[PDB]
Amino acid sequence: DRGVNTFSPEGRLFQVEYAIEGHKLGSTAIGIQTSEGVCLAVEKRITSPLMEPSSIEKIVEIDAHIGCAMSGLIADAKTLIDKARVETQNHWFTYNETMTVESVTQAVSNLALQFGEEDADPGAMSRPFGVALLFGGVDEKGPQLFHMDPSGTFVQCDARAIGSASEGAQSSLQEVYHKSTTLKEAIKSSLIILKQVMEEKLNATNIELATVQPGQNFHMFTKEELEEVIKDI
Amino acid sequence: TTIAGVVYKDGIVLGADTRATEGMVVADKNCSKIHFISPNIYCCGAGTAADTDMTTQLISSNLELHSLTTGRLPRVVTANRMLKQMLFRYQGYIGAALVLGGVDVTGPHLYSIYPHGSTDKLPYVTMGSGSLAAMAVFEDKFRPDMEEEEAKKLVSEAIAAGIFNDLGSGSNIDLCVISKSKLDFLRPYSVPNKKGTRFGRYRCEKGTTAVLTEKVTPL
Amino acid sequence: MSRGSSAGFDRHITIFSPEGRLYQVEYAFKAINQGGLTSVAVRGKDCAVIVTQKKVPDKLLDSSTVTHLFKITENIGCVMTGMTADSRSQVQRARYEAANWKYKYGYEIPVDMLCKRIADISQVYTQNAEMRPLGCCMILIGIDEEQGPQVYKCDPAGYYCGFKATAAGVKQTESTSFLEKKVKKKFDWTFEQTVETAITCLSTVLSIDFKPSEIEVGVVTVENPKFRILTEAEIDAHLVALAERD
Amino acid sequence: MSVMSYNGGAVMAMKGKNCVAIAADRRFGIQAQMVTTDFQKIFPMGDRLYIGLAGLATDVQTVAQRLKFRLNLYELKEGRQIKPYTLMSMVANLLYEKRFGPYYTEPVIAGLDPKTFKPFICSLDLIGCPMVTDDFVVSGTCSEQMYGMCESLWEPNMDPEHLFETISQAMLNAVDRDAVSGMGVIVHIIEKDKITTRTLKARMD
Amino acid sequence: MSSIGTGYDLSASTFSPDGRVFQVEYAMKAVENSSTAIGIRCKDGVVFGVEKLVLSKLYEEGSNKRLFNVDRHVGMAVAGLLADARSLADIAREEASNFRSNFGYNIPLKHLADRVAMYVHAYTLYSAVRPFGCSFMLGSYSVNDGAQLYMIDPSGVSYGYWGCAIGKARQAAKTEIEKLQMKEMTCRDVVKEVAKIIYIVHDEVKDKAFELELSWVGELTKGRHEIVPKDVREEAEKYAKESLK
Amino acid sequence: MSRRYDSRTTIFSPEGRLYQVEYAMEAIGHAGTCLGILANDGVLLAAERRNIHKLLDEVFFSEKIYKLNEDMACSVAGITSDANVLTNELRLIAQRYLLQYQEPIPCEQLVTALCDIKQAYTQFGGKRPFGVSLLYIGWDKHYGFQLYQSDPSGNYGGWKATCIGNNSAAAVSMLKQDYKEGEMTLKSALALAVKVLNKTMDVSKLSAEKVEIATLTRENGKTVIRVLKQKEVEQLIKKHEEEEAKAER
Amino acid sequence: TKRFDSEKAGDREVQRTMLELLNQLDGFQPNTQVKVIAATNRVDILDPALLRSGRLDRKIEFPMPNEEARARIM
Amino acid sequence: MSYDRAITVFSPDGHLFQVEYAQEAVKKGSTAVGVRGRDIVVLGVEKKSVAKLQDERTVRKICALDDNVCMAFAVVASVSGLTADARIVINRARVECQSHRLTVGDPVTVEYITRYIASLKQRYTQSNGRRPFGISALIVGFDFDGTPRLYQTDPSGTYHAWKANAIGRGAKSVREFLEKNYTDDAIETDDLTIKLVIKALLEVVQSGGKNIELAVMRRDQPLKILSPEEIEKYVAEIEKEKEENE
Amino acid sequence: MAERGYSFSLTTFSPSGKLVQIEYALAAVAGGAPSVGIKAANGVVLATEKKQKSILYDERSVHKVEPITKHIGLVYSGMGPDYRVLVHRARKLAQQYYLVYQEPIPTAQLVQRVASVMQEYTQSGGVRPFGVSLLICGWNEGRPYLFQSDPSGAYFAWKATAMGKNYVNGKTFLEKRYNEDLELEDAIHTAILTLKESFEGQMTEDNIEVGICNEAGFRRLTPTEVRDYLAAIA
Amino acid sequence: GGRRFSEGTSADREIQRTLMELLNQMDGFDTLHRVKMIMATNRPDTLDPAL
């Protein structure tokens, strides 16, 4: 035997290869960036609506002008986001500017891969993350949406979908979304794709909506507003 | 304060000491051992502060225990001299300890003086404490650099008693510790005087003018 | 089979085995023969002498540089027998141990004590599975500060004991046998005689007879505590002396 | 067995000897500063249940370090079916205070106890972090050491019974409380047989 | 060796029936596969020569460093795989760097060779880290021994050499050194001669071109260790090509 | 290390209970019977001493029963090397709690603290659990009188009368019928204790050396821990044989 | 490959066949004039009896290539 | 101390091995049900196998981390999961629970404690030499506005708010059935909340009303652990009511 | 050290109820040279036979009987390499206890302390469980002590026990001749009989060593004395 | 030279028999009056334990 820390005969790491496929078991993240705000839609991933939507969290505020929606292996994601909150805030605290979406994204990408059963300790990884994040927020330059994946690639996005089928979630986007479009269509364009990428229904207890907009912090949608957007497909 | 001396004779130590440790002329301790048996060929005399002196000797004593057992050959005097100098200086020392370090190595007898700072030095007869001068005036003349061993026990008993009686740094009794080179000889009576209290007639409270108050078992 | 059988993981790392010792430990003894060196150790009463073969595998070597005799302290000298890779490494470890005593004690370490600190060291390697035991053994000579000239040897597995005469090599059992008859018949020991016993015994078993640049003799005499290299001229002197004995 | 300061509202130990029993007398005093509210709480402790060791000054670390020492005494007491020697425990305490390095907080230990299974009389005091203190005479100790020392010489009855030492001691404690703030605050007198401990608690403020 | 499916050649805290680890031997092949480093001991200094293969025509000298300056009087010339060479370089630099600064004199080599070889060997012992598959030499000019050259193998064995070559044609290079007297010859002449052996090793039907790095620590530089001055460097190569033919 | 020498010594099973722990239970079985029975005024431990041979200096009080503290005691059934590491630490924690707190140590508190160390070995470290199951007898001022068991994993359960060693299954079954949760005085409790050793031990004549009963009773306002004497154990055995003959025919 | 202590299987037809080469190979039975061209990627699995100089006298290396060697093939 | 090679590694199966073994180990287990009241928030477990020779004290699955926060763990499996494993997650959350309780001036936010719980079981999955626990926990408490919560974690740390959630015996099976049981008129008084916990537990319990262990917790008063004899009285009332329904 | 290292245990239990490596270790102690230790109850005598088989050992130092400190001594069984660490270890412990008590380490206490370190060595990785059995003697506090420490970590207090070559025979003779609380003369005599039970390690005086602990401390006996005790047994 | 076998193949089956015969002629009941036998071995560690 040999590791997962070894190279395959392809000349690529074994552990990173496995991580992307792992994402596909779980939740979706759809972020559409328009010049009127950045919207995040994510699935609560329910078994019944009799599961309280009082404090299911999967879209969480990283900063109060940057929000983050997560996709992939949901468990691994919970610790990555909690951690992400302190580091962004150390940056917010020192610079005393409104954080840029691109700075939060770069910072979290080096933590993805530090894996190895040598040259690592308990605070360091012994496995790569298989969490792909969508950080969406408004900065000084304006609304930006960044995609982060386990290989650390950060890219600028106007619409990025990753989900249960990463491929699936994206193919629908091309079809619905178009470059310059209103906020209200942007929210809707997410509800039509959301279904496609889920194998599960449209329920108000099964989707979660959040908008970060100019002059306006990260907002969490309530049951009434969750319904307004469900109506918009 | 304290009274410690050594003399250089046929075997490693003839040690003289008072038992008492006094702070100026008040007794803190009526009897103690100021010249110590920890091993039986390494002996150490003490003076000055009690605390500083005990730790410096004990640390050497532990290192000596290892050499002694492995070789099955005698303890090494030099090792003891170097060890107290580096180790107590590092600590920076609470006050001063004049210590008399002594062991027979492989060669002749070596007696050393660790002064009030912290040092490794070579003489051959040491006296230590505030009474270093006082203990020395007898020792330096009666000893003429090796004398009869047995004669040295009479002479030393005489010197030691002189330190006790003329100099107020020594209550109760005087202790002599003799090693030829593995001997442990202790007689704590190098001065003639009564050891504790005397009660020929026994009254220390008038005949039951007070009575016994309660008896309990604390299991 | 045996000497290559799993029973735990004891043919891989140190843990006991069906053989009533340790397999990994036994390869470390077997390892001595591979190096190709054989040594004879004699303890005199004016010196303590070790003669070992000095491995010369080029003709582009300077004599001084290429040796197996090492100065551990200005009281102790040694020869390394076994695998040369392991030899350099053990000697550097010993040196720190000799030095560590050297400051504290204020005097030259006894030959017995030097062997005790290193022997224990070779045991850590042996106890550990983190590293394999040494493929070499260090055989010490020195003037003990009252007992006299002393010869101690620590094993590649690290146990040490005192010796009148010792041998380790390619042929450990046979050299030792040749050596007891030389002790039994007692010519006595001066500087020259004891060196002479030592070399001949190394020559007779292997059946070579040497050049002075392919044996090395190292002594610690009571001329001075410092360890010396005798060099080829004096080593040649001893070789010629061996003739028309006893 | 270093205790914070000495202010414990009372500091005094006296130990006095007979050939038929040996006695350790102690303030049972507790409560730091001049104000007390209490007059009870352990201070002398049985450690083999027939030997005592007394640790003296402020309550907290006095009780705390005694107990932590008790565990090392115990280890040695436990394993063998005969209990530890007084002479070996005497250096053990000396070292325990010494572990707390240069410019240490001052305790004053008093050990009173007959030796275990080699029968001779033993009294000793430690103070500071000092040289070995084996005596066979008498020992009095505390910060008002001179005041205790007087009394420890005062009670020895070499030939009377155990009982006469107690009644002499009751007066000895009282006269000492009028002389210093170290004696008093209730007094516990311990007459120690070798096979058990007898605790008597004396009448006296 | 063996090609057992569990350990011995797959670990290196495991000795063979004979007492050897197969893992160091596989590493020993690696010095043989690439170009040579020659180094000969003089008595006024040491002269080193490593041929650096021009693999790409868009390189400049200082690329794929086979020649390191260990201190300001200690050299290191390596042969074999360059990654294990770098590690060995780093340790050597720190060991040499503390000794000049602190003591104030030049390092006697024989101890240094033993320490570095201890480092190589300590790693061999372990199964958690690898044997080093480089062979390397250390060279120094000292005021306690004069010039010294020691060669340490991928096994952690140290021997002193009057004149060494480690590389892809040891047998041809050592022999040329044997014929010549360079053992106690003056460093200046040696520069030309070390280069000339490199010329024999090199083929114009196995190599295109090489870039000569020689290093001085000798009488020109007044015992200072510098990589060969451009004028001298060229002069020595110029001789190497001209004299064969 | 090496990953071919690793099939994971420490791992989770899908059956939820570690392989090495079930394997350790069989080892516990092998060592002799150690039991604890509750009294309504004490608690006692009864155990068979590892030694049974003529030769024994008798430096320990009993090899199995360790007197840990002045309100706590434990016995070990299983690996004796493994016993020495747990019993020495145990000695220190139980003692610190009675001494300082002036409040007698609960068994429930004690076990949770020790089990953390045992457990660490089973989940991570590449290690293995302890070979012993230890029976704690004590009194605390909280619940009252108690008996606790700990296992290799660091799993606990609090009984009031339990037996471990060989014929454990049979023993606990006998114990259920005669004792529930408190009905036996200190003397009946002790009689019950001798009875369980009797069936389970091969020798049914026993001896004071063969078995050791140590009692913990609070008498005269202080909690007393005592190892009973060879005479006292022998008197209990002599009383028990008469009663044995009559009980089972 | 000889190294057997095999009592469990291990054939020992294969044992005979390696041993037989040596037999033919010693001088007693001629082999001076006939050359054997021996080839192996792994000599990391063989024993010294079969290999080793003066039983198969010349030992020819082929190290990894370099640019010029690549140049002529291309 | 920790294992040099990792227990948990990303391998191809979609998750991880230890998560995968861990989901199996709470599936094959017994029922632990938690229903969210409007009085008291009550948790109960199916099995402890009580039979009157033993008494529960800390033996309980339900352990209070805090004055108003408690969690009930179902490590419990084919052959029984480990009380040893649960206790670590318990120790670490309880100290954190009390530190938050100190900081907030009204009853401790459950939310913090559950998020925390989820990260504790995940950090072991990324930590060298470690693996995640095979428990599922019902984190219960009241907020800083007094809002009752019943939350659940699985073995790798994922969290949801729930009205009522049931785990073990197939987690999906039992939790869909607890929705049916659950009424909002059956949580209006303290005995009715407790009756809903117990009805799910009765389904396949061996020797019920003794094995059934459930504890009640009040608004900021400590946990009240109910003995099985006292619990039995409620169990009789429902077990007859349930018979009547069929 | 300069590596990653090990930490995994080399011992895993069995559904037998045994630890595998300690059973292999037990075989190695039996393969040793006879070492007996008896507490008489008027002193403790540890006697051993040492296979040198050439008497080219100039030992006036290290032996199979080595004093740990001045009233503790140690005798082993099995192999020498494992002994070397344990003898050094014991001396260190002797030193730790010497500082605080200043009466060198007591026997009941020593064993617990060695036992704890021995257990780790099994329990942990990068170390392995011994295969030496130590017999520890001491006279301190006016009582003689004899303990046997097994290669697992276990400690038992014995009156008389045997190890080394043909221990089964030794322990059985020991029960018959020796009974509890017999004299110092009996303890010594049976002790030398067990060595004689089966010798075969060159019959010269320097091939047996005895070291005796009594009221005045511990000293090892000169080889010439040892031979006189042997001479009686035929 | 064979081993003790009896888990063997046909090849091993034959080898133990040759092994057996050699013992009986060489040092057994039968003896060798002036025939001396010379064995050459690279490593002897394949041969039967009796041999």
DSSP secondary structure of D102-131: SSPPPP--EEE-PPTTS----EEE--SS-S
Note whether F224 contacts B217, CB cutoff 8 Å: no
Q: Say how many residues make up chain J.
A: 51
Neighbours of C138 (CB within 10 A): 31
Residue with tokens 């290390």: F1
F61 lies in some domain: yes
* Shortest distance, CA C15 to any CA of chain F (angstroms): 13
Note whether G68 contacts E168, CB cutoff 8 Å: no
**Cα D142 from Cα D13, distance rounded (Å):** 6
**Cα H193 from Cα H175, distance rounded (Å):** 16
Across the strands, what pairs with F37?
Answer: F44
**Cα D111 from Cα D24, distance rounded (Å):** 9
Is residue D115 a contact partner of residue D153, using CB atoms and an 8 Å limit?
A: no
Using a CB–CB cutoff of 8 Å, tell me whether G58 touches chain E.
no
Give residue E194's identity as a one-letter amino acid code. Answer: V
Note whether I125 contacts C8, CB cutoff 8 Å: no
Using a CB–CB cutoff of 8 Å, tell me whether D95 touches chain I.
yes
Chain B hits for I61, Cβ within 8 Å: 70-72
* Experimental approach taken: cryo-EM
- Report the interhelical angle of C84-105 vs C111-127 (nearest 10°): 130
Give residue C78's identity as a one-letter amino acid code. Answer: C
Assigned token pair, F44: 């006692």
CATH 3.40.50.720 fits D2-205, yes or no: no
Assigned token pair, B190: 């190098």
Distances A119 to A79, A124, A126, E83 between C-alpha atoms, Å: 21, 9, 9, 19
* Shortest distance, CA D41 to any CA of chain F (angstroms): 11
Q: Where are the domains of chain B?
A: 1-197
**Cα E59 from Cα E57, distance rounded (Å):** 6
In sequence order, which residues have a C-beta less than 8 Å from that of residue E90 and are 6 or more positions away?
Answer: none
Please tell me which residue of chain J has the smallest CA distance to G2.
J46
Is residue B92 a contact partner of residue B84, using CB atoms and an 8 Å limit?
A: no
Note whether D98 contacts B172, CB cutoff 8 Å: no
Chain F hits for B218, Cβ within 8 Å: 222
Chain I hits for C18, Cβ within 8 Å: 24, 27
Is residue G31 a contact partner of residue G47, using CB atoms and an 8 Å limit?
A: no
Domain of I48 in residue numbering reads as: 4-232
Is residue E40 a contact partner of residue E194, using CB atoms and an 8 Å limit?
A: yes
Is residue C14 a contact partner of residue C157, using CB atoms and an 8 Å limit?
A: no
**Burial call E151-162: b when 16+ CB within 10 Å, e when fewer:** bbbbbbbbbbbb
Question: Which of I234, E60, D16 minimizes the C-alpha distance to B30?
Answer: D16
φ, ψ (nearest 5 deg) of residue D43: -140, -60
End-to-end CA distance of chain B: 44
**Residue C235 host element (H or E):** helix C231-241
Please tell me which residue of chain E has the smallest CA distance to C56.
E159
Question: Which of F56, F57, F77 minimizes the C-alpha distance to F65?
Answer: F77
* Shortest distance, CA D105 to any CA of chain F (angstroms): 21
Number of domains forming the structure of chain A: 1
Q: Considering Cα of H181, then H185, then H188, then H192, what sign does the dihedral take?
A: negative
Question: Which of A92, A89, A88 minimizes the C-alpha distance to A107?
Answer: A88
Distances A217 to A38, A39, A60, A87, A210 between C-alpha atoms, Å: 11, 12, 12, 19, 10
E2 lies in some domain: no
Chain C hits for E161, Cβ within 8 Å: 58, 60-62, 65
For residue A202, the 8-state DSSP code is -
The shortest CB-CB distance from H163 to any of A21, A52, A56 is to A52
The shortest CB-CB distance from E15 to any of C24, C87, C129 is to C24
End-to-end CA distance of chain I: 55
**Residue B6 host element (H or E):** strand B4-7
* Shortest distance, CA H57 to any CA of chain F (angstroms): 7
Query: Got the DSSP string for E49-85?
Result: EEEEE--SSS--BTBS--EEE-SSSEEEEEEE-HHHH
Active site residues per annotation of B: 1
Give which of C54, C59, C88, C137 to mutate to test E binding, by max E Cβ within 10 Å: C88
Q: Where do the H-state alpha helices sit in I164-215? A: 167-177, 184-197
**Cα A178 from Cα C164, distance rounded (Å):** 97
Give residue C229's identity as a one-letter amino acid code. Answer: I
- Report the interhelical angle of B50-71 vs D86-98 (nearest 10°): 120
Phi-psi region of F63 (alpha: psi -120 to 50; beta: other; left: phi over 0): alpha
Question: Which of E116, E117, E108 minimizes the C-alpha distance to E157?
Answer: E117
Please tell me which residue of chain G has the smallest CA distance to J4.
G7
Is residue H178 a contact partner of residue H167, using CB atoms and an 8 Å limit?
A: no
* Shortest distance, CA G6 to any CA of chain E (angstroms): 16
In sequence order, which residues have a C-beta less than 8 Å from that of residue H111 and are 6 or more positions away?
Answer: A55, H143, H149, H151
Assigned token pair, J45: 């560690």
Is residue I82 a contact partner of residue I131, using CB atoms and an 8 Å limit?
A: yes
Across the strands, what pairs with A145?
Answer: A136, A157
Q: Which long-range contacts (CB under 8 A, 24 or more apart) does C23-26 make?
A: C24/C132, C24/C133, C24/E14, C24/E15, C25/C126, C25/C133, C25/C157, C25/I81
Strands (DSSP E) found in A59-148: 59-61, 66-72, 131-138, 143-148
CATH 3.30.470.20 fits C2-245, yes or no: no
Assigned token pair, I151: 């290669």
In sequence order, which residues have a C-beta less than 8 Å from that of residue I20 and are 6 or more positions away?
Answer: C8, I11, I12, I14
Distances A10 to A13, A115, E140, H61, H158 between C-alpha atoms, Å: 9, 20, 46, 49, 35
**Cα A146 from Cα A60, distance rounded (Å):** 16
What is the topology classification, in CATH, of domain B1-197? Glutamine Phosphoribosylpyrophosphate, subunit 1, domain 1 (3.60.20)
Establish how many alpha carbons lie within 13 A of residue B86's alpha carbon, considering only the half-sphere containing its beta carbon. Answer: 10
**Cα I201 from Cα I219, distance rounded (Å):** 24
Q: Considering Cα of C16, then C20, then C22, then C23, what sign does the dihedral take?
A: negative
Neighbours of H237 (CB within 10 A): 13
SS3 of H175, please? helix
Note whether B218 contacts F224, CB cutoff 8 Å: no
* Shortest distance, CA F1 to any CA of chain A (angstroms): 10
* Shortest distance, CA I129 to any CA of chain H (angstroms): 18
Whole-angstrom Cα Rg for chain A: 18
Q: Where are the domains of chain D?
A: 2-205
Is residue A66 a contact partner of residue A101, using CB atoms and an 8 Å limit?
A: yes
Residue with tokens 């990654």: E83
Distances D21 to C100, D27, D112, D116 between C-alpha atoms, Å: 53, 20, 11, 14
CA C211 distance to own-chain centroid: 20
Across the strands, what pairs with I143?
Answer: I140
Distances H137 to A51, C106, H41, H126, H151 between C-alpha atoms, Å: 16, 65, 14, 20, 8
Note whether D156 contacts B209, CB cutoff 8 Å: no
Question: Which of E45, E3, E12, E235 minimizes the C-alpha distance to E130?
Answer: E12
Question: Which of F28, F21, F31, F50 minimizes the C-alpha distance to F115?
Answer: F21
Question: Which of E173, E236, E211 minimizes the C-alpha distance to E40?
Answer: E173
Chain F hits for A1, Cβ within 8 Å: 3-4, 6
Note whether C116 contacts I58, CB cutoff 8 Å: no
Number of domains forming the structure of chain H: 1
- Report the interhelical angle of D59-79 vs F80-101 (nearest 10°): 150
Note whether E6 contacts F1, CB cutoff 8 Å: no
**Cα H169 from Cα C178, distance rounded (Å):** 79
**Cα I5 from Cα I70, distance rounded (Å):** 38
SS3 of H168, please? coil
- Surface-to-core class of residue A137, CB atoms within 10 Å of its CB (0-12 exposed, 13-18 middle, 19+ buried): buried
Note whether I61 contacts B62, CB cutoff 8 Å: no
Q: Considering Cα of C226, then C231, then C234, then C240, what sign does the dihedral take?
A: positive
In sequence order, which residues have a C-beta less than 8 Å from that of residue J1 and are 6 or more positions away?
Answer: J15, J19, J46, J47, J48, J51
Interface list for E 86-145 with G (CB within 8 A) = none
With contact defined as 3+ CB pairs under 8 Å, the chains touching F are: A, B, C, D, E, H, I
Using a CB–CB cutoff of 8 Å, tell me whether F5 touches chain C.
yes
**Cα I120 from Cα I128, distance rounded (Å):** 9
**Cα C161 from Cα I50, distance rounded (Å):** 12
- Surface-to-core class of residue E198, CB atoms within 10 Å of its CB (0-12 exposed, 13-18 middle, 19+ buried): buried
Whole-angstrom Cα Rg for chain I: 18
Neighbours of G33 (CB within 10 A): 5
Is residue F32 a contact partner of residue F164, using CB atoms and an 8 Å limit?
A: no
Note whether D74 contacts F95, CB cutoff 8 Å: yes
Domain of A116 in residue numbering reads as: 1-233
**Burial call I169-205: b when 16+ CB within 10 Å, e when fewer:** ebbebbeeebeeebebebbbbbbbbbbbbebebeeee
SS3 of G2, please? coil
Number of domains forming the structure of chain I: 1
The shortest CB-CB distance from H14 to any of A22, A51, A79 is to A22
Residue with tokens 């080829």: C232
φ, ψ (nearest 5 deg) of residue B194: -65, 130
Domain of E117 in residue numbering reads as: 7-245
Q: What is the three-state SS of C63-125?
A: CCCCCCCEECCCCEEEEEEECHHHHHHHHHHHHHHHHHHHHHHCCCCCHHHHHHHHHHHHHHH
Is residue H42 a contact partner of residue H195, using CB atoms and an 8 Å limit?
A: no
CA E117 distance to own-chain centroid: 13
Neighbours of J39 (CB within 10 A): 8
Across the strands, what pairs with D198?
Answer: D191
Strands ordered across the beta sheet of B43-48: B36-37, B43-48, B97-104, B109-114
**Tell me, what CATH number does E239's domain have?**
3.60.20.10
Please tell me which residue of chain F has the smallest CA distance to C129.
F1
Question: Which of H172, H169, H179, H192 minimizes the C-alpha distance to H241?
Answer: H192
Domain of H229 in residue numbering reads as: 2-239
Give residue A97's identity as a one-letter amino acid code. Answer: E
**Cα F212 from Cα I194, distance rounded (Å):** 32
The shortest CB-CB distance from G67 to any of E32, E33, E208 is to E208
Query: Got the DSSP string for C180-226?
Result: HHHHHT-----HHHHHHHHHHHHHHHHT----TTSEEEEEEESS-SS
Tell me how many helices (H) and strands (E) chain G has: 2, 0
F5 lies in some domain: no
Distances A183 to A30, A31, A187 between C-alpha atoms, Å: 14, 12, 6
SS3 of E239, please? helix
Please tell me which residue of chain C has the smallest CA distance to I3.
C130
H244 lies in some domain: no
Q: Cis bond leading into C246, ω under 30°? A: yes
**Cα C68 from Cα C78, distance rounded (Å):** 8
Q: What is the three-state SS of H178-230?
A: HHHHCCCCCCCCHHHHHHHHHHHHHHHCCCCCCCCEEEECCCCCCCEECCHHH
Neighbours of F26 (CB within 10 A): 16
Number of domains forming the structure of chain F: 1
F6 lies in some domain: no
With contact defined as 3+ CB pairs under 8 Å, the chains touching J are: G
Number of domains forming the structure of chain E: 1
Residue with tokens 């059988």: C5
Is residue D195 a contact partner of residue D48, using CB atoms and an 8 Å limit?
A: no
Domain of F167 in residue numbering reads as: 19-247
Residue with tokens 């003689």: I144
In sequence order, which residues have a C-beta less than 8 Å from that of residue D156 and are 6 or more positions away?
Answer: B196, B197, B199, D16, D17, D18, D138
Give which of I10, I13, I113 to mutate to test F binding, by max F Cβ within 10 Å: I13
Angle (nearest 5°) at CA A130 between A124 and A135: 95
SS3 of A131, please? strand
Distances F94 to F67, F69, F98, F109, H42 between C-alpha atoms, Å: 10, 6, 7, 9, 34
- Surface-to-core class of residue F169, CB atoms within 10 Å of its CB (0-12 exposed, 13-18 middle, 19+ buried): exposed
Using a CB–CB cutoff of 8 Å, tell me whether F3 touches chain A.
yes
Give which of C102, C146, C150, C152 to mutate to test B binding, by max B Cβ within 10 Å: C146
Note whether E208 contacts G71, CB cutoff 8 Å: yes
Note whether C34 contacts E117, CB cutoff 8 Å: no
With contact defined as 3+ CB pairs under 8 Å, the chains touching H are: A, F, I
Note whether A79 contacts H123, CB cutoff 8 Å: yes
φ, ψ (nearest 5 deg) of residue C204: -75, -45
Is residue B100 a contact partner of residue C86, using CB atoms and an 8 Å limit?
A: no
Is residue D142 a contact partner of residue D11, using CB atoms and an 8 Å limit?
A: yes
Using a CB–CB cutoff of 8 Å, tell me whether F67 touches chain D.
yes
